[PDB]
Amino acid sequence: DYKLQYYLNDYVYAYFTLPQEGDKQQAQVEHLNSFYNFVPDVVRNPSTLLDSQLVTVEGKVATYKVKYKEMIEKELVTGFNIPFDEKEGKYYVSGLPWFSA
């Protein structure tokens, strides 16, 4: 579904672009949290997104293949699983994501 991909593309971008600057980080966390329909209870490291590709959608879990890099440059690749739902015609992220091979 194209609409789902447009929506989750923004979420994936936010997730994998935590900045280095502490003051920007506080706001970026709040921006990422805006995709959830809940406020997370209190970990991401500074990152840049290189590529993302929606691989499968099973039920209400979208699985992406994400290529990103930290700054510690090795390119990292992971599966990234996002639970989602819809309210009044608009998608939201329904739980914190999890990583897979």
Numbering used by the authors: 92 to 133, 139 to 168, 176 to 204
From the paper:
A structural analysis revealed that the OrfG central domain adopts a NTF2-like fold and likely presents more structural similarities with VirB8-like proteins TcpC and TraM from Gram-positive bacteria than Gram-negative VirB8 proteins.
A native crystal allowed final model refinement to 1.75 Å resolution (R free = 20.8%). Indeed, OrfG64–204 has no α 3 (replaced by an unobservable region) and a strand β4 that clearly splits in two short portions β4a and β4b separated by a bulge that ends with Pro200. Note that the electron density of OrfG central domain displayed a blob that remained unassigned despite attempts to fit various compounds in it. Surprisingly, the electron density of OrfG central domain displayed an unassigned blob nicely docked in a pocket localized in a hydrophobic cavity that shares intriguing similarity with the groove identified in Gram-negative VirB8 proteins. Thus, the localization of this groove suggests a probable oligomerization inhibition site for OrfG.
